[PDB]
Symmetry: D2
Subunit: 283 residues, 4 copies
């Protein structure tokens, strides 16, 4: 049933295809820093031969605290993304928080992401689907893997069949996430084989009961990225930073950028292996 | 412990007699809304319970694209205007987009932040700025000690009239549990905001492959009794004369003819607990 | 009808439509005099308020996390202490049983035998406890859904013991934490033919530090949770106390300070008496 | 360094940096010939692929939900069957132990003793198992966080047994369901001085109907989950199989169909060999 989603020339995501890296940074802060980090990803993915889509958010619309950093915002963010595409020739993914942002974002971004908390919001999902690019649906922490089909259906109803499904963990007691590795197959099979993507970064989130900003578990990114990629999936979603303690959002879960090549060579080796091993029909 | 004045004769607070935020899931038509609200007004008047009428003008978050959404903003506000004028009752409704807050606030007396949207800064701020009391539905994914940050967003733009509404926490897949310990944690970490218990939505559960929410209305009294016994500012309740025919959340709706039987138990328990001291257990 | 009553001792019968029974005491037996002194306080408070009473203590803590944590006086001394409690006060006692071979000797002295939470699926232990011929209090494991207790009740019934009570102590909620699902009480009663349901408010307050070596706990919130449970309409409350919970040798973080016993129990009786005279609604 | 190796028998050593050891077999001993036949299949497949092998079975299911469910041949017959398995195939065997007194006799025959998941906090059982002198496989309870196993390991260490392995079988996730937190493996290893971590893929697939009599399970997804766990880099995989899982008398819903053993194990070996030669990254 597997379905393949064409993102840009030489970049197609599909559960039986070599994995695609949706990699970048949490939030857009400035032009040069964005260009410099993206340059590193482009060089590392080109060297290793891994298909690549650059990620960043133009806005963090859901920070816990009114005081926390939100990013350069829509207008500056789209200008940064336009310069990233022209400099590197790389497709970009970003998240969309209001219906009215979908069309202008889709002029520049090559994939639009539905945020986890907002994936049940009909008018947002529909507006994102109608914008005419591939959609990455972040699976809410509150949503079981067999319920994503209804989000996919919303998109399908307005003529967008290019939908990918992104795991980022499930709520496990208070202030913690677990990743159910059994969910990847349930997402694919109940949606007609949509590409499934693993957000290893956000799956590492956890928090202090009284904290102002998310905690996170970057020291375990390889453990979890290994597990997910071994299942056999369309993509990996990853954020990095040269010094994660200085990141202005989700630093506790960000990969230190100098370890990108070390992580990706392990992902490519595991992915190339599992992608040539059969499923067993276990009845 | 902070008290929130909602309208004449209606003030909510954790040490005050509980306020019923009662009504129906979704606005469908004028006359049915008036008739159901009439029943709540009659029952609450008889029993002496303060009352705010609830309904949604839109269900913006249905699982399925094919599920019923309600009459929509323009018709919904017209219905509410008529409900207020006919019965003299304040009304609560939920707000899905920033731009809806100001027009909703012209008519509604309390604005509700939907559970899924409670982290959305621009929505919360827009709701806060509209200048009415705010009911924040606690997301299924949010711990009770994290609501303070939503309250602070509202406070930052000058709205100190914030209430916090329990509707359950995610418990495995497709199921909710209510942690009765969370009420106190919500109150104490937010400077004493009124805590409200949404017994209806706390009863939600679902089939892994279903198209619409399941629910456990047959257990509404068990859960309502438990929550009201803790000592809380309000109870949030939906009903329908025939819940199997409700177009949203019927599985968790109270059958309307049982409203008085339920409310007399809530009033009896609430009046008792509200005159019993806290023990300072150290 | 819809509800089964369990006779424990003269004037003490537990049932879901009856005035609640207090299964109250201390976590672990340490010495004769301290046990007698604490039980005396319970007896005086319960007599004054008119609450039926069964005194609780463990003779052994067979499941401490750490090999270095206190376990109690043990079986032989524990039963001697319980005999002296019964003779001094005329009160029935409840204690937990950890091995099949302990059931018969414990039943000579104790009036209710408790199956520990972790052990409730262990067929031979349940069957040996049922056979000893006293009422059984089954602690619902943190891992067990409320609709699965019926199988434990059936094990007991299979060897001729119909006198089974079901005790809530919370459900695992992520790591190192418990939540009490107040919807479970009815599910336990209805799927077992109306067995008495008991709420262990003390152990339901447990939680822990991920690296700790003994349980944490939330005694400051005992009244919130006890009020909630008793309002549902249940057969009993299970409660531990200590005069200084910080010095308790097991489960101090969840123990009620003993001087607050009367303040708590007067709230429980008031709520219980109210809800026990209010009808169920048949909600269809 | 950072990792401890446990010698089980000649040519079988389990350790987190070593090629993975398969603890494979059947849920419950029913008869001699069926046990021999199934073990023969495992031995042939593991010999061909070059995977170190320990044969698993239970002599008793002491924790069935239902008093009517099958329990197995029992201790005396079970040890006789194990003796024949060892003699015929030269393979070491692992079985679980349910009472302190069973530890010594089991240890005469079995090469690894397993502490059942529900019982892993029971001090006297853990100590008796540790004292019996063989390697211990601790099944991590569904209710226990990964950073709490250290206390079980310490109980064993206290009576002189340092040969302890830690076996994941899922964590309680709501009612009647399990999830495997793949982050736990490292936490178990690092907090216990590098004990071997083992993944029980079979029992991690358990789930149930709220009103059912016996466990449900998700065998159709065994490869997904086994791939994920083995990719993390672990000491062992624990697996049950049956030639026709629908007819298995315990845990059939989670059993691998036996004819698929080679297809599964070749994937495990390929993944394990790859990850075992790739470095950890020191992520700060
Ligand atoms: O940007 C993405 O890709 C996302 O998935 C959204 C994600 O970055 C955000 O939800 C952040 O995790 C979130 O704003 C951090 O929350 P806090 O640190 O404000 O508590
Ligand atoms: O109306 C309220 O007060 C609310 O709490 C919002 C609530 O009614 C909605 O989230 C509904 O519960 C929801 O749309 C039902 O979901 P489904 O039945 O479409 O799966
Ligand atoms: O005695 C009872 O009533 C029980 O419920 C058993 C209970 O007391 C015990 O499990 C204790 O809670 C337990 O041994 C203490 O845990 P820890 O502090 O050893 O981690
Ligand atoms: O034998 C093993 O390997 C184990 O882990 C113990 C395990 O087999 C048992 O807990 C069984 O899963 C259990 O007896 C079956 O449960 P039920 O079907 O009786 O509910």
């Amino acid at each position: 049933g597997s379905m393949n989603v064409a993102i840009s020339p030489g970049v197609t995501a599909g559960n039986s295809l070599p994995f695609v890296l949706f990699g970048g940074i949490n939030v857009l802060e400035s032009l040069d820093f964005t260009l410099d980090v993206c340059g590193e990803y482009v060089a590392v993915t080109r060297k290793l031969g891994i298909p690549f889509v650059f990620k960043a958010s133009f806005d963090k619309a859901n920070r816990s605290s009114i005081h926390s950093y939100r990013g350069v915002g829509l207008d500056e963010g789209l200008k940064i993304f336009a310069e990233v595409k022209a400099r590197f020739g790389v497709p970009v993914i970003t998240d969309v928080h209001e219906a009215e942002q979908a069309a202008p974002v889709a002029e520049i971004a090559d994939v639009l992401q539905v945020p986890a908390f907002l994936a049940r919001q009909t008018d947002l999902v529909v507006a994102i689907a109608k914008a005419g690019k591939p959609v990455n649906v972040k699976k809410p922490q509150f949503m079981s893997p067999t319920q994503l089909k209804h989000v996919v259906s919303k998109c399908g109803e307005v003529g967008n069949d290019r939908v990918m499904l992104c795991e980022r963990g499930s709520s496990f007691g208070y202030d913690n996430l677990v990743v159910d590795m059994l969910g990847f197959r349930q997402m694919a099979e109940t949606t007609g084989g949509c590409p499934v993507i693993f957000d290893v970064t956000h799956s590492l989130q956890c928090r202090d009961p009284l904290g102002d900003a998310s905690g996170g578990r970057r020291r375990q990114v390889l453990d979890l990225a290994r597990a997910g990629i071994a299942v056999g999936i369309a993509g990996l979603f990853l954020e990095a930073h040269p010094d994660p303690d200085r990141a202005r959002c989700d630093g506790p879960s960000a990969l230190p950028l100098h370890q990108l090549e070390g992580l990706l060579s392990q992902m490519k080796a595991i992915d190339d292996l599992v992608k040539r091993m059969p499923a067993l029909e276990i009845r």
